[PDB]
Design a protein around this ligand. Structure first.
Ligand SMILES: Nc1ncnc2c1ncn2[C@@H]1O[C@H](COP(=O)(O)OP(=O)(O)O)[C@@H](O)[C@@H]1OP(=O)(O)O
Length: 265
């Protein structure tokens, strides 16, 4: 029985196993996906033991993304840019391959929502690892990005890092250009001028509040904004992409998302 897992701390809350099981079912892939608690200190040793004992691959969530990336033998451009990895596959030759499907998951979910038209003007709030993990595929999807963060230096580093891949402007949080943004993405854990939010056409939170509105969506809703989404689809889509890397079959993202949402509600 092929073994996969999600590694994190905490991990008790993870939906990854539920999602991956449905993804396996849908594609009739024979495999099992479990949740693994990564020790804050021993994670590296535990992970390697996990692969030495024969696991085929795994997802990585907080706080080990960076750390997992450093462990890999080979990695994708996506992982390289993110300098972090949410997916590992132990290749047949023994190599540990890192990828980061967070960005393509985000792209895939926005496409489901029809919120990813080429040359959209997109505001992204936050410049932590989450943003860092999605910028490359967003830029590759011809999103013109205005990036703003509480801490300006990090905004500038990211704009500098991704400048070669498309249009991204770093701005101070207190000088976000007042314009209509086709899409605003919250990638904070976390203070945007409400006047900016009010002009926005669509609002996406990478955060997913199991069974409720995230702070960001609640905020948007309090300003009378209605075209909103949390990031549950992003969670399902990144999983589907990880699955595709492992299995060589692309699960039907929309179906599983729908079932999970049905499961969900
Ligand atoms: N109270 C707050 N207000 C604004 N942004 C906040 C916030 N708390 C967390 N964040 C943000 O959330 C991002 C980090 O979120 P996170 O705790 O989920 O980590 P990561 O993005 O690596 O997953 C950072 O952009 C950002 O602030 P700073 O770079 O200035 O630390």
């Amino acid at each position: 029985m092929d073994l996969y897992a999600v590694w994190g701390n905490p991990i008790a809350q993870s939906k990854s196993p539920l999602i991956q099981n449905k993804l396996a079912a849908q594609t009739h892939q024979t495999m099992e996906y479990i949740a693994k608690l990564g020790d804050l200190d021993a994670f590296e040793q535990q992970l390697l033991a996990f692969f030495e004992e024969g696991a085929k691959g795994c997802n990585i969530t907080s706080p080990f993304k960076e750390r997992a990336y450093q462990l890999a033998d080979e990695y994708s451009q996506r992982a390289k840019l993110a300098e972090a990895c949410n997916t590992l596959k132990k290749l047949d030759d023994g190599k540990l391959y890192a990828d980061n499907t967070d960005g393509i998951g985000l792209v895939t979910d926005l496409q489901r929502l029809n919120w990813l038209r080429p040359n959209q003007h997109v505001l992204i709030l936050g410049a932590g690892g989450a943003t860092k993990g999605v910028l490359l595929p967003l830029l590759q999807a011809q999103q013109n990005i205005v990036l703003a963060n509480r801490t300006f230096s990090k905004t500038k580093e990211l704009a500098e890092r991704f400048q070669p891949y498309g249009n991204i402007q770093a701005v101070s949080m207190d000088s976000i250009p007042l314009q209509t943004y086709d899409l605003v993405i919250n990638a904070t854990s976390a203070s945007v001028d409400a006047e900016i939010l009010k002009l926005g056409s669509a609002f996406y939170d990478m955060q997913y509040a199991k069974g409720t509105d995230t702070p960001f969506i609640a905020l948007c809703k309090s300003l009378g904004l209605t075209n909103v989404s949390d990031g549950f689809g992003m969670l399902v889509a990144q999983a589907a992409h990880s699955f595709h890397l492992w299995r060589g079959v692309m699960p039907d993202f929309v179906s599983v998302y729908e079932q999970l949402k049905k499961a969900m509600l």
